[PDB]
From Swiss-Prot, chain A:
Family membership: Belongs to the mitochondrion-specific ribosomal protein mL42 family.
Residues of the full protein shown: 35 to 142 of 142
Domain of life, per lineage: Eukaryota
Main location: mitochondrion
Compartments, record wording: Mitochondrion
Keyword Mitochondrion among UniProt keywords: yes
GO CC term, one of those recorded: mitochondrial small ribosomal subunit
Keywords per UniProt: Mitochondrion, Ribonucleoprotein, Ribosomal protein, Transit peptide
Protein name: Large ribosomal subunit protein mL42
Species in which this protein is naturally found: Homo sapiens
Annotated gene: MRPL42
Lineage, broadest ranks: Eukaryota, Metazoa, Chordata, Craniata, Vertebrata
GO molecular function: RNA binding; structural constituent of ribosome
Subunit structure as annotated in this protein's UniProt entry: Component of the mitochondrial large ribosomal subunit (mt-LSU). Mature mammalian 55S mitochondrial ribosomes consist of a small (28S) and a large (39S) subunit. The 28S small subunit contains a 12S ribosomal RNA (12S mt-rRNA) and 30 different proteins. The 39S large subunit contains a 16S rRNA (16S mt-rRNA), a copy of mitochondrial valine transfer RNA (mt-tRNA(Val)), which plays an integral structural role, and 52 different proteins.
Signal peptide limits: none
GO biological process: mitochondrial translation; translation
UniProtKB/Swiss-Prot annotation, chain D:
Subcellular location: Mitochondrion
Keywords from the named record: Mitochondrion, Ribonucleoprotein, Ribosomal protein
Main location: mitochondrion
Entry's family note: Belongs to the mitochondrion-specific ribosomal protein mL63 family.
GO biological process entries: mitochondrial translation
Name of the featured protein: Large ribosomal subunit protein mL63
Domain of life from the UniProt record: Eukaryota
GO molecular function term, any single one: structural constituent of ribosome
Subunit structure: Component of the mitochondrial large ribosomal subunit (mt-LSU). Mature mammalian 55S mitochondrial ribosomes consist of a small (28S) and a large (39S) subunit. The 28S small subunit contains a 12S ribosomal RNA (12S mt-rRNA) and 30 different proteins. The 39S large subunit contains a 16S rRNA (16S mt-rRNA), a copy of mitochondrial valine transfer RNA (mt-tRNA(Val)), which plays an integral structural role, and 52 different proteins.
GO cellular component: mitochondrial inner membrane; mitochondrial large ribosomal subunit; mitochondrial ribosome; mitochondrion
Swiss-Prot record, chain E:
Keyword Mitochondrion found: yes
Keywords from the UniProt entry: Mitochondrion, Ribonucleoprotein, Ribosomal protein, Transit peptide
GO BP annotation list: mitochondrial translation
Cited InterPro entries: Ribosomal_bL20 (IPR005813), Ribosomal_protein_bL20_C (IPR035566)
Name recorded for this polypeptide: Large ribosomal subunit protein bL20m
Family to which this protein belongs: Belongs to the bacterial ribosomal protein bL20 family.
Signal peptide: none
Gene Ontology molecular function: RNA binding; rRNA binding; structural constituent of ribosome
Example of a GO cellular component annotation carried by this entry: mitochondrial large ribosomal subunit
Gene label: MRPL20
UniProtKB/Swiss-Prot annotation, chain H:
Protein's recorded name: Large ribosomal subunit protein uL30m
Gene, per the UniProt record: MRPL30
The keyword Transit peptide appears for this protein: yes
Swiss-Prot/TrEMBL GO biological process terms: mitochondrial translation
Keyword flag Nuclease: no
Domain of life: Eukaryota
Signal peptide (from-to): none
Subunit structure: Component of the mitochondrial large ribosomal subunit (mt-LSU). Mature mammalian 55S mitochondrial ribosomes consist of a small (28S) and a large (39S) subunit. The 28S small subunit contains a 12S ribosomal RNA (12S mt-rRNA) and 30 different proteins. The 39S large subunit contains a 16S rRNA (16S mt-rRNA), a copy of mitochondrial valine transfer RNA (mt-tRNA(Val)), which plays an integral structural role, and 52 different proteins.
Full-sequence range covered: 35 to 154 of 161
Family designation: Belongs to the universal ribosomal protein uL30 family.
Recorded GO CC terms: mitochondrial inner membrane; mitochondrial large ribosomal subunit; mitochondrion
Primary location recorded for the protein, binned into one broad class: mitochondrion
Length: 82, 59, 85, 79, 140, 156, 148, 120
């Protein structure tokens, strides 16, 4: 009845040693969300910057523009990965 | 896993509203929990520039 | 956490001696063993000169005590062979 | 004004413990001083005769014809 | 002038190709660009130490966060994984924390199990059987 | 030796009772048998290995790339078995060694793609008022490995 | 420095190790003066080493041009259409051999800064961390202070 | 004035309590020391800097073998605050010419003359 963590939320962790005691086997299949745990699907510059601040829960400063020196330093073709 | 690129990215960096009842609590010990969740330091995806803080509602 | 590793006779730093740093990192896919790592060759040279030093100092200590025992025995023979005539 | 924490005391103390065990292992030599005398005089003398010998064997290097003539190759061309 | 210097556009331009992205007159006036360019190269080499340092604290932040999700703290996780002879490092544990959270959950289970065997072993003192995950593999 | 239940009577942490080693070693035998059946019948999908190549641990799947900061002195195209794998994970199980896994258990292959140099990398020293200014430019050798396959074997 | 230079991610050209390995170096173009002191080591490279080199990898086509140059060059062209022009000016044969093998061993990608030392295209297997991994669900999907 | 410090001899006389503490025998003592520098010679007098150079301890955390003779012990007594000393114990013999290459000094203080990298 011992569980080293409450195997409830992410995966059911079942640790093991082998007979040699050299490898630790972990066995951890995923915990599916139960059907009972779900809800059915339901069916001007100043005021515009205040309105965006209040909408996205940020301060006002990132809505003011920036000058050309900063707009042209920006890398428009940045490296992608993955 | 097996999401598309855009909803995986939305899912990871989405921010979570937490509730935190401050009755009979000390304010600094509330402030520590609140501060960790406001910076996003409770996420393993954390980074300073990646802007992954959450909302803390203290009642 | 290396004080634990000192309790178990391991190196205090897991990058010390033992199987993580002294087995070869790679092989050929055929199963031909790789040429040895540079740091492992260096390290085996260090261990060998260390072992040579242990043997050398041990032998100078032992030869030292044996020569001293000859000097003491020959002093006593020079005692007993001059108490005569 | 600077004050002494628990880190500083515990650090100081573990250095004192290493020191005390150094005191222990220096308390039982394998030989007396009479026994050790000249037990390594030969190896010390040979070592210094090697130092002395490398000191007194210092001289200009050999000069070769092949090097001096090999400078002529700077105008080697094709035909 | 017997021999005055012909090839001086290129000495200047050796410095100023490094300054083209500064602000102000540092990007054009050699006298200013030299002090800033030198100073940029010194920062550029002292920043190798800080790159290594800041990666490591970044990993400790991510391992700390991910292990607090499973109730552990960071010293408990790292200590009791060393004690299982699982010598994974901080970079790999942070990357498992983000990309393989079941492996990370099972590592947190292995570290808290080892932590409890440490408790129970150092409580019932004397000659007893050792813990199962507490055993070590001797190498000779 | 009774103490009545106060705040500081007991320690604040709840007591855990670890299971007895008879039923626990039997339980481990059940688990290892399960996972060994998953490795036999090929239940797993793609694997990731943590491999101690060179001086550091690379977390690695198949079909990817590792950039190593030294010349390995192999030809481009040569396959390589990376020993020193110390974690192997699938979706539903992992296997972690103390500290390394068995060579009979896991096999990680990798080819050499390219052997480059690094970008030029500046080393400048400067002390003020001392006329102390050195500059060096260093490029380290590098090789790129392509991890081809992580094959796993039923040896538990 | 890194903020002055461009950077990129670690890549291959067409997944260069997956199926088979392809030598990324198409053409070399040596140009070597006949009479000229700077292309001496180039001359001794064409005479000694370039035929052995040309046989050790036949996917590379090598052009030795041999005009009156004042600085000799080698011009490596790569399958992805990159061109690396390097000089073999006043180099020994051994230095030219190590340079040509260096150009052979590498690919056409730039030797600018590489951002990460690795490139998975499938970094996660158990599913990447989102904030609802490692959280338990509730009965009937309720949230805090939800009545029914 | 800061001077060189003599240390009295009562400091270097073990008690049976200490033989119970560390693992030593006063009869049949050990032949070889392992000495390691664990502290810097910076901010130390020049004589201690010299003794560290003589004993071959310029690099820290690197073990060095010495003889347990009173001369070497005299030099060690001068710098005993910078070093660590343990007895070189040898579980198997000293290494023969067959086992000369395949040795390893372990952390315990022992020098093993067969160093495989297999588990027992
Ligand atoms: Mg550090």
């Amino acid at each position: 009845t011992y569980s080293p963590l409450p195997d409830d939320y992410n995966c059911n962790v079942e640790l093991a040693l082998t007979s040699d005691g050299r490898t630790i086997v972990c066995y951890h299949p995923s915990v599916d969300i139960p059907y009972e745990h779900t809800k059915p699907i339901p069916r001007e510059e100043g005021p515009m910057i205040e309105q965006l601040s209040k909408m996205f829960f940020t301060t006002k400063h990132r809505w003011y523009p920036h000058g050309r020196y900063h707009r042209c330093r920006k890398n428009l073709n940045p490296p992608k990965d993955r | 896993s097996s999401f598309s690129r855009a909803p995986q990215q939305w899912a990871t960096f989405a921010r979570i509203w937490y509730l935190l009842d401050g009755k009979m609590q000390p304010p600094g010990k509330l402030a520590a929990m609140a501060s960790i969740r406001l910076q996003g330091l409770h996420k393993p995806v954390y980074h300073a520039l990646s802007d992954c803080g959450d909302h803390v509602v203290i009642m | 956490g290396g004080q634990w590793r000192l309790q178990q006779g391991l190196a205090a730093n897991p990058s010390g001696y033992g199987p993580l740093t002294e087995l070869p990192d790679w092989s050929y896919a055929d199963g031909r063993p790789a040429p040895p790592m540079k740091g492992q060759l260096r390290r085996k040279a260090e261990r060998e000169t260390f072992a040579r030093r242990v043997v050398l100092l041990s032998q100078e200590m032992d030869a030292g005590l044996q020569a001293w025992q000859l000097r003491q025995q020959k002093l006593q023979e020079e005692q007993r062979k001059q108490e005569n005539a | 004004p600077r004050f002494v924490s628990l880190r500083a005391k515990q650090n100081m103390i573990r250095r004192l413990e290493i020191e005390a065990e150094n005191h222990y292992w220096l308390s039982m030599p394998y030989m007396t001083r009479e026994q050790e005398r000249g037990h390594a005089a030969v190896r010390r003398r040979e070592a210094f005769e090697a130092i002395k010998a490398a000191a007194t064997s210092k001289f200009p290097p050999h000069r070769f014809i092949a090097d001096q003539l090999d400078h002529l190759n700077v105008t080697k061309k094709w035909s | 002038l017997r021999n005055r210097v012909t090839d001086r556009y290129f000495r200047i331009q050796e410095v100023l190709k490094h300054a083209r992205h500064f602000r102000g007159r540092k990007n054009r006036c050699y006298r200013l660009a030299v002090r800033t360019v030198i100073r940029a190269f010194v920062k550029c080499t002292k920043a190798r130490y800080l790159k290594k340092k800041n990666m490591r604290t970044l990993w400790i932040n991510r391992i700390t966060a991910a292990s607090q999700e499973h109730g552990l703290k960071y010293p408990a996780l790292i200590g009791n994984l060393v004690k299982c002879q699982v010598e994974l490092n901080r970079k790999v544990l942070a990357d498992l924390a983000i990309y393989e959270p079941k492996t990370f959950k099972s590592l947190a289970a292995l570290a808290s199990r080892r932590r409890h065997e440490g408790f129970a072993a150092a409580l019932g003192d004397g000659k007893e059987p050792e813990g199962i995950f507490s055993r070590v593999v001797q190498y000779h | 030796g009774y103490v009545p239940k106060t705040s500081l009577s007991s320690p604040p942490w709840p007591e855990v009772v670890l299971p007895d080693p008879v039923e626990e070693t039997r339980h481990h035998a059940e688990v290892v048998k399960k996972v060994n059946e998953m490795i036999v019948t090929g239940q797993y999908g793609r694997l990731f290995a943590v491999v101690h190549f060179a001086s550091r641990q690379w977390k690695v799947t198949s079909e990817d790339l590792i950039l190593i900061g030294n010349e390995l002195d192999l030809a481009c195209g040569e396959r390589i078995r990376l020993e020193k794998v110390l974690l192997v994970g699938a979706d539903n199980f992992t296997l972690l060694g103390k500290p390394l896994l068995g060579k009979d258990l896991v096999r990680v292959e990798a080819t050499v793609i390219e052997k480059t140099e690094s970008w030029p990398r500046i080393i400048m020293r400067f002390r003020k008022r001392k006329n102390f200014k050195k500059k060096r430019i260093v490029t380290t050798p590098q090789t790129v490995l392509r991890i081809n396959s992580i094959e796993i074997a039923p040896c538990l | 420095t890194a903020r002055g230079t461009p950077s990129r991610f670690l890549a291959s050209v067409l997944h260069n190790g997956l199926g088979r390995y392809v030598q990324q170096l198409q053409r070399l173009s040596f140009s070597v003066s006949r009479d000229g002191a700077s292309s001496r080591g180039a001359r001794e490279f064409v005479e000694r080493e370039v035929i052995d080199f040309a046989r050790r990898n036949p996917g590379v086509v090598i052009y030795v041009n041999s005009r009156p140059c004042c600085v000799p060059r080698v011009v490596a062209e790569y399958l992805n259409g990159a061109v690396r022009e390097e000089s073999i000016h006043c180099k020994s044969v051994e230095e030219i051999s190590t340079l040509v093998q260096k150009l052979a061993d590498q690919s056409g990608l730039d030797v600018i800064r590489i951002r990460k030392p690795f490139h998975t295209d499938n970094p996660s297997i158990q599913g990447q961390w989102h904030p609802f991994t490692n959280k338990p669900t509730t009965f009937r999907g309720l949230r805090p202070r939800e009545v029914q | 004035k800061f001077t060189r410090s003599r240390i009295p001899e009562k400091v270097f006389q073990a008690s049976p309590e200490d033989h119970e503490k560390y693992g030593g025998d006063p009869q049949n003592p050990h032949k070889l020391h392992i000495v390691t520098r664990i502290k810097s010679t910076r901010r130390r007098p020049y004589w201690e800097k010299d003794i560290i150079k003589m004993l071959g301890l310029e690099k820290a955390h690197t073990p060095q073998v010495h003889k347990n003779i009173p001369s070497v012990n005299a030099k060690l007594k001068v710098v005993k605050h910078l070093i660590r000393i343990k007895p070189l114990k040898l579980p198997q013999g000293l290494p023969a010419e067959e086992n000369m290459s395949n040795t390893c000094l372990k952390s315990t203080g022992e020098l093993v003359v067969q160093w495989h990298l297999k588990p027992v």
